């Protein structure tokens, strides 16, 4: 079972506003619960 999974991986290795919204929502939760 030659583990080519690394080989297939590397062969596959060849500021999102959505992300910003997610960060905001996490931050807002933390603010709400944070003392």
């Amino acid at each position: 079972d030659i583990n080519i999974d690394d080989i297939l991986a590397e062969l596959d290795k060849e500021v999102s506003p959505q992300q910003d919204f997610s960060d905001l929502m996490k931050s807002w939760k933390n603010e709400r619960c944070s003392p």
Partner: protein, 424 residues
């Protein structure tokens, strides 16, 4: 003996109920209901934006219905009455009755955006125009089903003597071309439960449904419950039906290896790489008036040995090798058809080029899994053959790296020669 009965794609019988789906397809589904003699026909469209639902009562009791974006083709076999109803409503529902000799019963009706087609038990193919002006009448082997997608019309010519046959043709506005004519259709008829027979009474041929593919490749689903696609249909020389799904095996798979029965894939239409169909988990293989949400299943090359899976299980586990082979074959056939359509009919969506590129990538990487499998077996010759089929030279770098990690210096040398040859 066999009985010739009216048929519509994916139709359903009344059964014990007074309402049945005259037919269903991607565009929509039309279901009728008995109502104090007069029948109530309801025309439902899947895409609400494209069209608007409308229901009318049918005194003629039309049993044959064809649905296409342009309109509907309602007809009654025993009477010969055929009524077309343009969906746009800009044009009146032109209607006429065809000449039905003694015993001549309409087998099915095909609608073309420009022409109209009617099939009879006697095989009296009849052609009318969008406004009902007749075109010509032809005798052919009796047609049981009359799928028609865009200008591509696919017919199933069956006879007690001529046997199972099919004719593929794209009439089009002009340059009518007959891709195939009554060639033998490689499908398996049902074996001769009460609901099964009743459907066979409602569908003697046992055709679960008939339709073209999303891109427009003919698709068939017989009583065997296997979805067969005519690979290379555009080219009769290499035209060949490929089983892209064996619903029974897939159901037994998703069931956790359980031999379920009530499940019944009701073929609705084949999306690219995925089949839109309703899983009727009831005694009646056909669905009920409260039509459920259509289900989507990806196509699967039937290369799974049920015994292998059972031995693995004793959630079904598939060997990475047999899986990889299945994905190899599926990607290969999908890429074949995709390239054929792209070069022959362009693309209705630009994404198809990238889809084909990614599919070629997956094809090469499946060759790479199987290459590693062969290398583990020390079958450097088989692995060399695998790398030979490899489409991408970068994937070939991956393959030579695998051979190095597999400790096959002879293999590595072979793949190096392959690098040079491809560079040549």
């Amino acid at each position: 003996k066999f009985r010739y009965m009216p048929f519509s794609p994916a139709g359903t019988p009344f059964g014990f109920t007074d309402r049945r789906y005259l037919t269903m397809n991607e565009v929509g589904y039309v279901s009728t209901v008995k109502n104090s003699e007069q029948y109530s026909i309801t025309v439902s469209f899947f895409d609400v934006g494209r069209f608007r639902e409308y229901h009318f009562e049918d005194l003629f009791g039309y049993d044959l219905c064809f649905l296409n974006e342009k309109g509907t083709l309602f007809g009654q076999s025993k009477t010969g009455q055929i009524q077309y109803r343009p969906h746009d409503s800009i044009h009146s529902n032109w209607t006429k009755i065809i000449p039905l000799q003694a015993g001549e019963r309409i087998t099915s009706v095909a609608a073309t955006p420009v022409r109209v087609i009617v099939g009879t038990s006697l095989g009296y193919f009849r052609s009318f125009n969008q406004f009902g002006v007749p075109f010509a009448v032809e005798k052919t082997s009796p047609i049981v089903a009359l799928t028609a997608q865009n200008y591509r019309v696919f017919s199933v010519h069956y006879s007690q003597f001529h046997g199972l046959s099919y004719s593929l043709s794209e009439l089009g506005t002009s340059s009518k071309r007959y891709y195939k004519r009554e060639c033998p259709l490689p499908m398996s008829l049902p074996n001769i439960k009460d609901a099964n027979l009743d459907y066979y009474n409602f569908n003697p041929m046992g055709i679960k449904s008939l339709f073209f593919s999303s891109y427009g490749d003919p698709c068939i689903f017989g009583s065997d419950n296997t979805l067969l696609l005519l690979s290379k249909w555009r080219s009769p020389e290499e035209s060949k039906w490929l089983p892209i799904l064996d619903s029974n095996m897939e159901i037994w798979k998703m069931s956790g290896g359980k031999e379920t029965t009530d499940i019944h894939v009701w073929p609705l239409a084949l999306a690219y790489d995925t089949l839109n169909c309703i899983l009727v988990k009831g005694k009646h293989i056909w669905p009920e008036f409260p039509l459920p949400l259509p289900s989507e299943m990806e196509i699967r090359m039937p290369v799974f040995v049920k015994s292998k899976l059972l031995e693995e299980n004793k959630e079904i586990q598939i060997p990475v090798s047999m899986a990889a082979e299945e994905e190899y074959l599926r990607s290969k056939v999908l890429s074949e058809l995709l390239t054929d359509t792209l070069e022959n009919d362009g693309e209705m969506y630009g994404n198809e080029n990238e889809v084909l590129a990614a599919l070629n990538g997956a094809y090469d990487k499946a060759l790479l899994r199987l290459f590693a499998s062969a290398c583990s077996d020390q079958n450097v010759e088989k692995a060399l053959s695998l790398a030979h089929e490899l489409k991408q030279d970068r994937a070939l770098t991956a393959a030579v790296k695998i051979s190095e990690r597999a400790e096959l210096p002879s293999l590595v040398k072979k793949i190096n020669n392959i690098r040079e040859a491809r560079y040549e």
